[PDB]
Amino acid sequence: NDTSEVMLLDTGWEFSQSGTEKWMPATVPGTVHQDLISHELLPNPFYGMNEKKIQWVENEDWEYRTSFIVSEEQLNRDGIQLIFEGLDTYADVYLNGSLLLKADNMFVGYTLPVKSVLRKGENHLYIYFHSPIRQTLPQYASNGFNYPADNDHHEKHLSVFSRKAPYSYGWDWGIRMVTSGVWRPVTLRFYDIATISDYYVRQLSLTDENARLSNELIVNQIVPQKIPAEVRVNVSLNGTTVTEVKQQVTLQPGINHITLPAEVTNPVRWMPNGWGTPTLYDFSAQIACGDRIVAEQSHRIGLRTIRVVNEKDKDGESFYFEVNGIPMFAKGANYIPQDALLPNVTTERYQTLFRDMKEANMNMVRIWGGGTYENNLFYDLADENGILVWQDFMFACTPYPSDPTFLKRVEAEAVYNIRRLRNHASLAMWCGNNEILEALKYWGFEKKFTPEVYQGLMHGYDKLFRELLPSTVKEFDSDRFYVHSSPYLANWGRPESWGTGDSHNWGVWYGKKPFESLDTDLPRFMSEFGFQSFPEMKTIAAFAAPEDYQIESEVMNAHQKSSIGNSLIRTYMERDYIIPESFEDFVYVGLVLQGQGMRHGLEAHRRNRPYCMGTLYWQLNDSWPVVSWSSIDYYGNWKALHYQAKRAFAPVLINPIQQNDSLSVYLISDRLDTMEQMTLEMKVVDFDGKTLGKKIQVHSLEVPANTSKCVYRAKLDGWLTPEDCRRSFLKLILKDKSGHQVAESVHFFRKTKDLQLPPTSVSYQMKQTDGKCELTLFSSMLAKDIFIETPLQGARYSDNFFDLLPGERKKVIITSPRIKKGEELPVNIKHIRETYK
């Protein structure tokens, strides 16, 4: 890119428990815990009851060291800069006898001038990590009260004192592994003249005819002389220059601010998943001094507008996203860290997770505030997949300190990550925290703390979430939306508040409300709602024994962290399904349950646009093997919920909704084009495959762009008897003028437990080659909610958790790199009727 040389300090690292004098090889970026595991100095933290057996680690201090060589030629470069993209958390960094840095915030990258401290030959780097617990014990003792952070799984709630990933201290789906280490890369850059400290491509305006941009560079010049330079910006698309601009300057020692306007005529816009291509331009800034390009930085840039509209209206206060001027109904999920040990998350795992969102027709992900500001790769993948990103700051569920030192650390991370992320097309909004305002209003505090301490907490809220964070966003990301808290007003126990802003409706699960309540309890935007399930058996076998297999054994409860657990799964299951006697069948039906109940809500929210303008379910993914609200387990396996979210988020959806012994059929489209001259066709089919009555035809339908509309209503009485309702289903297709199918749905008229399901044999043929299995499935009679189960971790399915309709063949492709020709894939097909006698 330029004349600099970058040395990655990713080898030759060793670590030691402080005070032992024993050193072992370590992997950096990494964690103390992984380094221990890799020498069998911890048990598999995820296996069994082993969580208690790993806790001692957080009490020790840990040292890391490496050495490296610098040449006489490198040492004579104008500048040499050591960069820590991440240190978790309290780290004293020494290089060749110099204390370079006393680090104290996991979420901040540190850039350090080191030329004057480096030596020709061997150079020695030592990092001392103070235990974040022992570091903060004296701070807690001075505080005189315990912050109410119930997800911090320790008697003393020390999490609140440290700018360290909240979930690391435990959460209601997570293991406590309070880890330390060099968690993101370390980089030594040898360079001449200057580095580009920041490059911000600021969009000033965008219309169909012109995008106007301001390229804002901050250049740190490291030599004593004034240096003539030319700044150049090249804008390209797919390798071809679109526009190019330049500016002469003379760079002064220290910081220089440079602004170059650029325009792209007839811009090709970045569109979200579902509405087109997520086009990205390549913007490259260079600093040229004489012949040499001494510094260069590039960003991929998406040209689009995002506006969050949050305005008083007749229904209360709206909360929705307008993308490229068009209201966009949000479809997605809440994202949590993908591992207890962040650096174990590989490039491949990030890529697969985005394939999983894109394939489920999502257009939004919330990076929830108990995790981390995600790495650059996460955002690059969001940009290239058309997925909008809601980014919480990293504060969740408790009030936090607001003393001057604490607020300076926070300001440092807010500036760092805002500048880090603000060039991403995907980045859509910032949210000050998760549930802290709700917590302060509703969760009991005025009777847990003195009135003085409670008042302090309330003024402390404002200092951080209503002043410091919104001011920082206004300064560094001024055209992006900020809201101080999610949910900002609406509270799930208070119906009167549901028309105001975004909701976390935990009436389902925590309030024990039936899934049917999601049809009536409607929000303006659902930013959280959820339901737990045990993960499938091959994941259970990664973490439990057949002994170790009851819903409330020590081990199952050890793998449940919500305030209840596993009893609640059984309670809800009983409402809708016959509860199976075996543990394996109970796991299967609980997957089915979570998928069917949650998709009922996803459909209610889309059906009720424009009152409701988004749904993000809790939660996408898992950080370890566990029972949780996730749609995808720790090993990448889609639960039923993920297949059902795909179906519910389909661009065009036929949604039959039955209430009060009556059926309505809604046609729901997130297409940018209107469909004309459409025909809905339906027919009742019993479980043996025989049609009941005649086909019903609704012709001449239009499905306008971005709308949900009722096209058919019929009372059940006079049409089907209670007996038929238990013994048949409705098949629904939507087709264009010429008979081409654009959508299909199936409807059942009774709860699954009330269906008279025939005993049946799902048979299959298989064609297996390397990487691939093609199965053809057949059953003469209905097989309900079939699960095609294979022991192969992370195998992918074209479909799963679907009703196999009577006498109707169904092709399913299974893929995995570990599918070998001639070593046939174990396949177990389960279905509802098989689970009881």
Ligand SMILES: OC[C@@H]1[C@@H](O)[C@H](O)[C@H](O)c2[nH]c(CNc3ccccc3)c[n+]21
């Ligand atoms: O409990 C599941 C999820 C959480 O993991 C996550 O923090 C997410 O923001 C969230 N919000 C709630 C609702 N609020 C509470 C539930 C239980 C105890 C305290 C608060 C539930 N959940």
Ligand SMILES: [Br-]
């Ligand atoms: Br330097």
Ligand SMILES: [Br-]
């Ligand atoms: Br520097």
Ligand SMILES: [Br-]
């Ligand atoms: Br300047």
Ligand SMILES: [Br-]
């Ligand atoms: Br605010």
Ligand SMILES: [Br-]
């Ligand atoms: Br009904």
